[PDB]
Symmetry: C2
Subunit: 133 residues, 2 copies
């Protein structure tokens, strides 16, 4: 049965967590949230570097960041040499939105991680990383 | 950092596995694949029951199954009483497509699960289920 497939149960969990995230933060997706935290950690980060936080393609990030700056959450500047290269900052509003979302996302994570001891959480992470090499 | 968030690393893994799936099976997504296996296990399954395999909403499943029968992969029949209620079978082609995809999907799963011992696989599953209650 599908319940016996590790990666099926994985999509079940990922979707349950995503669905809770959608209910609590309907206007800030997990990829948007992660991108914004990467920007807050490294203001002026090069736009291309943000695909790691976004776990997306260059195209999906382009569409994402365009939507985000149209919503006044981020601003961008270009390289005078190569205007494709772009740098990303949070706007004042973006910082406010991010500040409010962090404890919300943390608590959504906790709805699930809270069902595990500390040793089990650390060990769930070791397994995920081991499967990614 | 985001790498220290269990559910961020989880999306990293899920997307890596999804990206491999997309490369090997570009015409059969994981939700489509899971739905088809649920149909093959229970021919004539009620369409509503398939949201569990699809890990989706009723609407996403509707769009999915419509696309799948337009591609000749599944067929559907209606309840003479309540024609919203529908039953789903695989077509001959669908069975052929599913037969070919199973070993492909299994081997994609193995690219990741293969990096874990049997005890670690079973234990990754116990953790995922424990976080879903």
């Amino acid at each position: 049965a599908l319940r016996n497939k590790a990666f099926h149960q994985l999509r079940q969990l990922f979707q349950q967590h995503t669905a809770r995230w959608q209910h609590e933060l309907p206007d800030l997706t997990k990829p948007q949230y992660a991108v914004m935290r990467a920007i807050a950690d490294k203001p002026g980060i090069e736009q291309v570097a943000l695909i790691e936080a976004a776990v997306s393609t260059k195209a999906t990030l382009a569409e994402m960041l365009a939507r985000m700056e149209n919503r006044g959450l981020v601003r961008r500047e270009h390289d005078a040499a190569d205007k494709r290269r772009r740098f990303v900052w949070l706007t004042a509003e973006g910082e406010k939105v991010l500040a409010a979302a962090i404890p919300i996302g943390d608590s959504v994570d906790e709805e699930f991680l809270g069902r595990l001891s500390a040793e089990e959480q650390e060990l769930f992470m070791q397994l995920v990383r081991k499967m990614m090499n």
